[PDB]
Design a protein around this ligand. Structure first.
Ligand SMILES: C=CC1=C(C)/C(=C/C2=[NH+]C(=C\c3[nH]c(/C=C4\NC(=O)[C@@H](C)\C4=C/C)c(C)c3CCC(=O)O)/C(CCC(=O)O)=C2C)NC1=O
Ligand SMILES: C=CC1=C(C)/C(=C/C2=[NH+]C(=C\c3[nH]c(/C=C4\NC(=O)[C@@H](C)\C4=C/C)c(C)c3CCC(=O)O)/C(CCC(=O)O)=C2C)NC1=O
Lengths: 579, 577
């Protein structure tokens, strides 16, 4: 949430509270035109710029309290047709006028809710068509970048044109350039995340072009300053004459620039880069030449998509035979440890790494160049806390500070999680390499020291330690193809272990059956002998001749049935053991 | 492989051999310009059109055997700079000339040859059009804004945005026309009308036209290339003469002038912007350029609006997604979580019948076909190679299950894992379908030798068709698939541990089964060896039996009574364990 503006009452903006700044509501314009705000229905003038009286050529008492029907006889009914109520504020309408005083004026109109903004500017071969075909025929991405910068400098006649590109970590890098002879080179120089605040990145995805005609210019405000309808500051998001933030104005003065111009490159609802332009002297570009730039904004935004997709397709043509066998093996494998650790597939050459870690079942077997054993278990605990399905890093020292000492063995890391929860995984490791980064001006740590912008824009060398070979984007697309084959083959790996679990229940069915029957079928004969031991006590106690005394061998003939009981038992005990 | 052309010696083209036709090598041009071919290095003229003598204004003996340095004083060194040797043939160069009226020149390089084309030449429309498309709400709405804008600039009779299905049949999705004319809107068209080599060409080159349908083709002399002794390729030629097949097709339709612009999304042909005019009509080259911007601007804006339609549809089914994904990730029993009518896994996909197959038992829910036919269907899915099967008509793909139409017409299938071991199937019932075909149906396209006469509304009754799947539903389904295959990792982690516990129980059976069996053999021998004592002493007068010692004999079987006492205790414990 941003702070209120200066005219209403707000704090002075420094380096601490830059993220919260009213950029889109300056309440002022740059002095090479005039501004009028009007009702969406009536057409009555509500606000004016102070210089509008001179720029049009009427008294300011006349213009205030006047319908647009008076000013624009032809334009007014055609303007209402183009911009109906309840439309996106990004939609613009442009028309040329014949004003007798000024000569020729170019008019721009857009609708912010229940208000109509108006902007006025002075106005007057096959270049674009030849440029279009030049981009759609460029071989690679670096080559496309070169063709853009050259072409833009030709049309515009600027001092310096450069294609600026954002990293996924929101830090800039100049990737192409074309300059006037006898000047500095800004090529390669990386730049902080602090220079471009986050709300500006939010704006530049919506509106696509802005400029500054003069850096040492004074802002011309509006009267009345606040909107009559809402009693709030008037929004100037889609305004071309939106006055630049006083912060950024100071930044270009120290650089030595008079005129700025940028065009936002947008890929799939995201800010991919900028086409930034500098001029040493104050300079104004005609509106009919700004239009030509806006086509090159949209043409590039399409052509970036194609060339980046052709680079990854070309890289994944070299590693074709090396892919085919790896994918064929890790799909029919039931033993993951004794197929993927085999140095006939060389699963360190596919990803061009030093150390590979394979984790399946519950034993981390090793291959290549790996760190000491206790530190590996410290690393695998850190991956289980990580939420995704793939972990990609070039510097491990920043993400995990405990493993900053493991730099010589493992600096870069690529990780896959087959399944979910990091139970089974694969890890690639790249060794440490010497790294020197050329920062334009100052490093990101030195950006928060000064109260305003930095003075120096020279080449600065920083020694970075804990950095490996950065991963090619083709390798990560390769890796995710491997992941989904190992998770796909998991379906056949469960289909077997269920069948082995079914066979063990059959063996447990035998143990409980034989363990119960034989135990209780033993209890009767052993009681039968012990109850015949009762007979062996009944006879010789009396010591006299019993009526069983003759048939004592028939009594023995009765325990002969009992001897044959244990005889049949001991035979059955050996058979059930054998199974 | 295409047949050789007519001038060299080839067969007459009919409906049978349309797929094999030399389209890109006609050896002729349309007669509203002139053509010159030249060496890539020397600049000597090698071939000419027959009408080039009149169109430029020199004798044809003069022009043949002349350098380009003579003709173009300014252009020649700037032309060589723009097109270096070994460049894509798609790259073009254009320049305006002052010929004593005005000529517009177009040049491109096919290998070791330089093609040249000549054509007669002379506010904020485009800029306002650009912002109109980038502000359209939906895809249908964007289509409307394109057609209107194109008709305004060009002044054509009929403009229509044409769109291909993934099965390569056309459908007109937007239109704008002159008042008092037929409406072609909605009408579907066959795969036969646009051959496959033309679809291969239109991905490379993006614009072509026909200025007159009843025009005679003006050929080249010499007809064959001097360098290679082969026909001269005219792929990237604007004045490439139209195929005699397609020329007949527009005559029966009642069209004089054709123009189309190829829409290209991600290296694929998405659609066309087709234009018709009843009268012969020529468009100036400076107005063709304006169309070519609208070709590229649309190709970007199609991508955005289609992605916003799927994002909007998958906002309604947000709470209905969240619970389903949360349950089918922690589930260990798939059958007794997903068949539960508290998640309603027939409402997510708006279907009649759901089949769940896990372990090896197909439980049913909703409206399902008879039981033996289900096993016939699951055998057909196992032969299918992919990870998702998507169909609206099952009758065409699987002819054996054409009788199962009332229960199952449409099908969506997922394979959790691989090999169709475990799956999910959705089924939609049969619905009445009437399709409006423009002219004739695809079966009636192969009957006639040439093009069809009728272009009127034709009604065909189609049976075996359900509600066609919304593309947002298929993106929803593939999100479910990867959660069920993802949760499979935890489902194996458990069944191994249960397999470890059953080996412990098998270790007990083999231990107790061996020991007790052999430790029983001794006591039973001890009783049988005491039966030996019972044979030795059947009378008291023997050396062993004394009346006091008979209770010590009983004292010896007291050791045997304590044997079975210790046994019966051990028999109850090993039963419990
Ligand atoms: C050599 C390379 C190079 C870089 C790295 C670069 C960055 C850059 N900043 C931009 C915008 C803004 N930056 C800040 C704030 C700060 N600027 C800082 O550096 C510190 C002092 C700071 C705050 C702590 C603000 C308020 C704005 C919005 C201004 C507005 O539109 O009202 C723009 C777009 C403007 C344009 O087109 O030139 C770019 C491209 N300009 C270059 O040409
Ligand atoms: C009302 C809707 C509508 C439809 C459905 C339609 C189709 C269509 N056919 C096209 C192309 C070709 N067709 C054929 C051949 C055949 N044509 C048939 O119908 C049968 C007889 C046949 C072979 C068996 C050939 C050789 C070509 C390549 C021409 C060349 O480049 O030389 C084009 C692009 C041309 C253009 O801009 O008009 C389209 C868009 N034209 C429409 O406006």
């Amino acid at each position: 949430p941003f702070f209120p503006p200066l005219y209403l009452g707000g704090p002075e903006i420094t380096t601490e509270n830059c993220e919260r700044e009213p950029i889109h509501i300056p309440g002022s314009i740059q002095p090479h035109g005039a501004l009028l705000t009007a009702d969406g229905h009536s057409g009555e003038v509500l606000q004016m710029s102070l210089n509008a009286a001179t720029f049009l050529g009427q008294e300011p008492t006349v213009l205030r309290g006047q319908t647009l029907a008076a000013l624009l006889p032809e334009q007014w009914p055609a303007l209402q047709a183009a911009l109906p109520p309840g439309c996106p504020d990004a939609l613009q309408y442009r028309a040329t006028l014949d004003w007798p005083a000024a000569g020729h004026l170019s008019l721009t109109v857009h609708r912010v809710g229940e208000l109509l903004i108006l902007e006025f500017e002075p106005t007057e071969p096959h270049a674009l068509r030849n440029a279009m075909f030049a981009l759609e025929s460029a071989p690679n991405l670096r080559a496309l970048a070169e063709v853009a910068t050259q072409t833009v400098r030709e049309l515009t006649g600027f001092d310096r044109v450069m294609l600026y590109k954002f990293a996924p970590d929101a830090t800039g890098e100049v990737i192409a350039e074309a300059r006037r002879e006898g000047l500095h080179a800004f090529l390669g120089h990386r730049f902080p995340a602090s220079d471009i605040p986050a709300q500006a990145r939010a704006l530049y995805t919506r509106h696509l072009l802005r400029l500054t005609a003069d850096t040492r210019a004074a802002a011309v405000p509006l009267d009345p300053v606040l909107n009559p309808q809402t009693n709030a500051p008037t929004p100037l998001g889609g305004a071309v004459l939106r006055a630049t933030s006083p912060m950024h104005m100071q930044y270009l003065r120290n650089m030595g620039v008079g005129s700025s111009l940028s065009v936002s490159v947008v890929v799939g609802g995201q800010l991919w880069g900028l086409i930034a332009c500098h001029h040493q002297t104050p300079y104004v570009l005609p509106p009919d030449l700004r239009t030509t730039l806006e086509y090159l904004g949209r043409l590039l935004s399409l052509q970036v998509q194609v060339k980046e997709a052709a680079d990854v397709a070309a890289f994944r043509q070299s590693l074709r035979e090396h892919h085919a066998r790896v994918a064929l093996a890790a799909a029919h494998s039931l033993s993951p440890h004794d197929t993927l650790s085999d140095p006939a597939l060389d699963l360190l050459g596919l990803m061009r790494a030093g150390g590979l870690i394979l984790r399946f079942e519950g034993r981390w077997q090793t291959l290549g160049e790996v760190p000491p054993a206790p530190a590996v278990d410290a690393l695998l605990a850190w991956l289980e806390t990580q939420p995704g399905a793939l972990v990609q890093t070039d510097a491990l020292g920043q993400l995990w500070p405990a493993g900053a000492d493991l730099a010589p063995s493992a600096a870069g890391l690529l990780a896959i999680s087959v399944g979910e929860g990091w139970s089974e995984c694969l890890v690639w490791l790249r060794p440490e390499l010497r790294l020197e980064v050329a920062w334009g001006g100052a490093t990101p740590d030195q950006a928060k020291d000064d109260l305003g912008p930095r003075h120096s824009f020279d080449t600065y060398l920083e020694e970075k330690r804990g950095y490996a070979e950065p991963w090619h984007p083709g390798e990560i697309e390769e890796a995710q193809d491997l992941r989904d084959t190992l998770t796909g083959a998991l379906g056949e790996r469960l289909s077997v272990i269920r069948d082995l679990n079914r066979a063990l229940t059959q063996s447990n069915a035998e143990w409980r059956q034989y363990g119960f029957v034989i135990s209780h079928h033993m209890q009767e004969p052993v009681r039968l002998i012990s109850q015949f031991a009762e007979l062996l006590t009944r006879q010789p106690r009396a010591q006299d001749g019993s009526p069983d005394s003759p048939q004592t061998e028939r009594i023995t003939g009765f325990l002969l049935r009992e001897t044959s009981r244990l005889r049949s038992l001991t035979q059955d005990l050996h058979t059930y053991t054998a199974l």
